[PDB]
């Protein structure tokens, strides 16, 4: 139960909390792709 | 460390080994004299040697020496002439050897100024001659006393010669003939192997290390055969095992003896009066060796006490008059809830914890107890204090009266000599595994350790 | 050369593991009770 | 033990001030 | 002359370094040692549960050193500050477990000052500063059982008793309340002390067996496992593994103070009908239930 | 330049320590602006997550909600007794933090990638420059003092806060008479942190909360002005090294202490954290168990009432450790000596029995080995927030201990090792 | 005869040697059986328990559980009379536990033989093999000697996370193993061992020699050296002034890091060996009698006895299904 | 064909078969 018009955004909201723990991973993915220099 | 003085001298290691042989036999003769001083020989039924902390005495009587020169025997009887070889002359012979080994170790320590494609082969025939001779002359009874054998109920143990059991029945641990046949066969094999290594054939720490391997492996085997019970550890000498309590082996044997005898002609009071007190005493959890404690030292009789006598078999009946059975204590439980079950398996009575409501309390279930055989034969108790008193006693198997003042007993179960032997030789095995590793590594690494 | 027989036989062994359980063969091979076989009713 | 409360309150004040003024000096 | 006191206190020439954390440590250690020893020997029984059933913790009231403890402050006090002067009498203070609160409130700051003293000497010796980081693991562990767990539970009677058997009693009661065995932070703590012991014995054995040469010490260890080799990385890992794990288990005790408990897999496997199929976790739960019912003085969910 | 281990001295796993140098102050800014976007991204995301899965039957604390209670406590979209009126205010707040995370995120990436490597002019700061860093401390102290008064102005004028202590349950109300009196406001700081006292965690009315924030907001404004105008004085020269990693460690120690206070605050306080939103405190849920047990049996006179060590009528048994708990549903039955026997006879409104019955099922004086819950286990939001923030408080104290020693060692010059 | 010795003794990625003919198949079989049991094999017919991933268990609750009590101390060989070659029966009676337990010993033996073989080949002292004798002593005492002394393999430790947790709790209630002095020396060995690990590693790290200029010191041209990477003098000065005493010799300290946990584990192995015969420690009958004669009297020892009573009664109906204990609710202990 | 091939394929052949079955148990209805 959320506002009626914004039911469609839906699963994108269900990803929104764990989007910060992906930036922590991309700090290691960027570190991977520069050779850990 | 300190004792590495004698590595560069053989004769002073013969001296050190003779010295150890002096200490071993000297202990064995004086430990057996200590046991003889403390031993009560009056009741072999109710105060046998396994209740009295006799360590060495069962090992002496295992092999045929069962008499004292005072006249008594550990079997049952009181010979006028007990023969030459008694517990005293076994002890004396060990003490006389010990002093003579003291004298010989001194001579070897001072006069050492006196070859191993030959020595181990010499040692192996000698051990083979001893082993074959022990099996074929001592144990057979041909030129010896024999060994202790008994029925599996442990009621009629005595010394007799034993014929070697040469087949697969001989590898049954409870067959006494196998041990005879083992010693004849391995004795021959060791003589053949020994004369092989005399005619057809480096570090002394390696020899020590491999000897320690034999010692720890044997110690576990010795601990295992002690704890599990074989022909070589009779229950008249070392008591019942924990496994005989586990499967109710004596309980089943007694009930077999009673159901047979009821079926012949007799009444339950007559049937249970035919159960030997010795047999009923084995079916009591304080005789199980798995009830002791690490620091509960001494004899089993320092615990529950001197048994006075069997009370008889308690039979419990509720208000319906249907037969009830207390669930017996397992070895694992220091205390166990007293619950009474009928023949189908339903709880009919118990001794509750608080006692808050019982629905099933003894007072409201109207449980009575009647005894057949023993001291209380023909007596019925109906008062709850009596019935609750005997229900707790029945949970430990057949009830016995104990005198706690003969040995000033403290009520805490001790393990038997069987339990003390098995425990120490497990410890000895674990320690000697480490010593084997320690000396094996030092022998294999004598160039990086030195 | 190397990566041909691994694209075939690695999902083949994963499928055979999958088909071991999904067809119930794992229950018979080990005697493991099925969910309706723990309490014989 | 109303005097002992004073004794403790002073003892805590003295030792803590020692620690405070110890790191106030600077080394 | 004040600088002279400043010079002696910070001097690295004494037999023991005092330092500024150490002038705030030897009083606290002075009190906490003195009260602990006196209470361990001679304290009268403590009504730990607050319901007038006193618990005898001291040597002179029936205990040996194995069973003796300084008994935690009474449940009646709760988390109240209970100094010796706020009691009505001296005996009422001893009855409500006053000495325990005296000991714990001097011992915990003294350890924190021991932490800072270890930093302080390392600074004055020109060392890198992080031995005190390593020591923060047993400090956090002991603060969790003596301070944080009582705060979360609302009573210092739930703290660790200061004795050998009281400690064991604390372990079993905690398992009943919280299922610490199935807590992953305790799982990490066990891996930290058992593995910490493993690495200690291994490092001890590897180094001592190469005294006469790391080239044959790594020819060994490289051959025993697949082929660090960096003494800095290895020694960091030797410090880090017990320390990090003990941090987690201290945080486990601390979060269990708020009743964030171990994993409950009771009734977690069901049959086709919905009958609970017991697992090993349910057996552990029954065992911990046996602890729980004896510790409870009125349960309200058991016939 | 300073973007690899060779020219920085720091390895990749310490790669943020390459922003310590004043050569790279522009990237220092972009790290912080991008990180604040990440904080706002979670705040928006978690709120919209909590709003999306929200169901109107279970109150707020039975749904794993930790952000929605914070919005409700400001009075945003709640009515009497903390019931949600409209979820759209909660949605409006969550979306705004997303947009704020986009602005902060974009500017964080701008300065970290596109902007200058070092700032210049007014925004150029050197860590060793005592006047400049203190000036930035002054600007930042002022801003949070601004926002403390903005929070107090919101409570006084713009909609007010949810007061659980309002009669008849709870209700949003303007805090029209905040406690400006300094002996009440600063008397909280000398109150001991122990039981019954509860140093600042025992603030139990909105007048004291709002009065304290006016005192905080103003003192932070005067402090901020003090640091902008006055550069650090000579007594603060050799107290510690004036380097960047020193300042980080001092923040870490303070923020570690803050998390511990917050963990205590969510665990014990039911004024700033009303129980209609966060659930009952464990002290208050044990009072709820005993109170409804009185109203069951009857329906120290009894088996549930004893004396406190101070001699007051309290709830008996295990919950006598919790006799200092005060709840807005219990407080109308509290006389001059603790619980009042006449008020536990006939004073109890249906809402207090309603409120206490909900808070029954939240109290760990039962069994853990079958289940300790309502349905099943039930970890409370107070448990989650206090556990999480104790963990943050501990690690940040460790991070304080780490950074402070390293700051000391690096200025004195022996952070790399000893001399042979 | 010396052909195969050359191939065993070779320079490859993993050394095999003569010990590897015992270690590698037995460890693979022991680990392979554990994975097989925890994935597919039930404990319904031995324990009335569900114990594999096929059942619905997770890692924390899967186990290769001990054999049924009816099996006694049988080896439960696949071709033995209990299974008679029937693999379904063999897994159902707990034959995988004996398979895992007995193959585990031979891999553990094979591993320590491998330690000896490599140390002999390289030419160093075999103290690692001496130190590994303590995990082997613990394993033999707990997994073999204890069930052998008891009534069946059933009472041994199951190969699982929660089965081990049951084993821990069983030893409190039934053996009071916390009060056992040998377990006490074991705990001192393990916590002291962990303490030595943390102090020594921190001491080395924080007394490192400054060699290079990088702010990460994991590369200061001294890690290859070994121990001489850190200042022994500064470390001794720190600990003689913080603690009072310091380990002044590097050989003695590393001897002590060997000795403390290894001796501790060997102590716990002796305590466990005693419990194979139910030889539990420390009655303290004076406190028991006094609390049976004075209701005012209670110690933490007598509280623990009551806790162990509660453990024994509330666990054993479920924990020993073959015994089929019936404890009515009234006979169960409680403090209610 | 010696140890290197047999060591990897004795420890990955069952390990992906088992992981195939454990993946299949997650979609078991009970
Ligand atoms: C805590 C305890 C300490 C740790 C425990 C470790 C102790 C290890 C020893 C355990 C002792 C076991 C005693 C149990 C009795 C039942 C065993 C049994 O019934 O098992 C003992 C076994 C099996 O015995 C079999 O017992 C059966 C009954 C049948 O009679 C078989 O014929 C008989 O072989 O005995 C055998 O054969 C074995 C004999 C090997 C002889 C091979 C020598 C070579 C012979 C050349 C010829
Ligand atoms: C909130 C998370 C966060 C943020 C905002 C940053 C931000 C930044 N990092 Mg980074 N970093 C992070 C987490 C983060 N990091 C983590 C978790 C690691 C370990 C994998 C790293 C390891 C790392 C390295 C090795 C470097 C950076 C660097 C940088 C800066 C420039 C990178 C660039 O130009 O593009 C930048 C401001 C670079 C830098 O120091 O700027 C000079 C760089 O050298 N970081
Ligand atoms: C202060 C830190 C904090 C606290 C106290 C909480 C607390 C909570 N979170 Mg949350 N969360 C956080 C940070 C925090 N979170 C961060 C940084 C993220 C981004 C990764 C999330 C993403 C997140 C999601 C997606 C969910 C939660 C959920 C929850 C609730 C149930 C926790 C649970 O059982 O999961 C288990 C705990 C562990 C596995 C450890 C709980 C009240 C759940 C919820 O109830 O939603 C309303 C849920 O679905 N959180
Ligand atoms: C902590 C917050 C913060 C701070 C201190 C700054 C500071 C600064 N920004 Mg910036 N910025 C921020 C957040 C911040 N920004 C956010 C959230 C955004 C997204 C809207 C931007 C997007 C931005 C742009 C596009 C530019 C700046 C620029 C600047 C510099 C302007 C100097 C001046 O005199 O005015 C200055 C260093 C200017 C610059 O790069 O200086 C040369 C500039 O071009 N910022
Ligand atoms: C605002 C708080 C704060 C800030 C700004 C810093 C900043 C810094 N710290 Mg740090 N630190 C902190 C708090 C903080 N710290 C706390 C609370 C602790 C206690 C644990 C530490 C312990 C610490 C150590 C030991 C070190 C630093 C170091 C540093 C410097 C380099 C670190 C780096 O490049 O990033 C690198 C980032 C990574 C390598 C990734 C972090 C990996 C962590 C352990 C995982 C996080 C777990 C997370 C909750 C779960 C993730 C979910 C999962 C799905 C991934 C840098 C200037 C280094 C230094 O001293 O340089 C001079 C260094 O050695 N810190
Ligand atoms: C000379 C001589 C003689 C005499 C002899 C004799 C008289 C003897 C003896 C002897 C003896 C009488 C002996 C002995 C012995 C003993 C021993 C040898 C022992 C011991 C011990 C031990 C070994 C122990 C130890 C310990 C303890 C103390 C306790 C426990 C622990 C331990 C182990 C530590 C004659 C005339 C005949 C001949 C000739 C000459
Ligand atoms: C060398 C190999 C020796 C082969 C012959 C060994 C058997 O040796 C002989 O065994 C018999 C068994 O009948 C022993 O005899 C023993 O058992 C018999 C019957 O079994 C009993 O009646 C008797 O009381 C007892 O002494 C003899 O004392 C011994 O002389
Ligand atoms: Ca509970
Ligand atoms: Cl208790
Ligand atoms: Fe080292």
Author numbering:
A (entry chain K): 9 to 45
B (entry chain B): 7 to 120, 134 to 220, 232 to 480
C (entry chain E): 18 to 58
D (entry chain I): 1 to 27
E (entry chain A): 14 to 225, 248 to 262, 266 to 341
F (entry chain C): 28 to 326, 339 to 413, 419 to 464
G (entry chain D): 15 to 350
H (entry chain F): 15 to 44
Copy text verbatim from the article accompanying this structure deposition.
pmcPhotosystem II (PSII) is a water:plastoquinone photooxidoreductase that, together with photosystem I (PSI), serves as the major entry point for solar energy into the biosphere. Specifically, the PSII subunits D1 (PsbA), D2 (PsbD), CP47 (PsbB), CP43 (PsbC), and the 10 kDa phosphoprotein (PsbH) are replaced with FRL-specific paralogs; in addition, one Chl d and approximately four Chl f molecules replace five of the 35 Chl a molecules that are found exclusively in white light (WL) PSII. Light absorption by antenna pigments, including chlorophyll (Chl) molecules, initiates excitation energy transfer that ultimately results in charge separation in the reaction center core.
Based on these observations, we conclude that ChlD1 is Chl d, and it was assigned as such in the structural model. The only Chl exhibiting an obvious H-bond donation to the C3 position is ChlD1 in the ETC, and the two residues involved in this H-bonding specifically occur in polypeptides expressed in FRL in the sequence alignment. Based on the observations described here, Chl f molecules were assigned in sites PsbB2-605, PsbB2-608, PsbB2-614, and PsbC2-507. The apo-FRL-PSII structure presented here clearly shows that Psb28 is not required to achieve the configuration in which PsbD3-Glu241 ligates the NH-Fe, at least in this organism under these conditions (see the Experimental procedures section). The apo-FRL-PSII structure lacks QB, and the PsbA loop D–E is disordered, some of its residues being found in different positions compared with mature PSII.
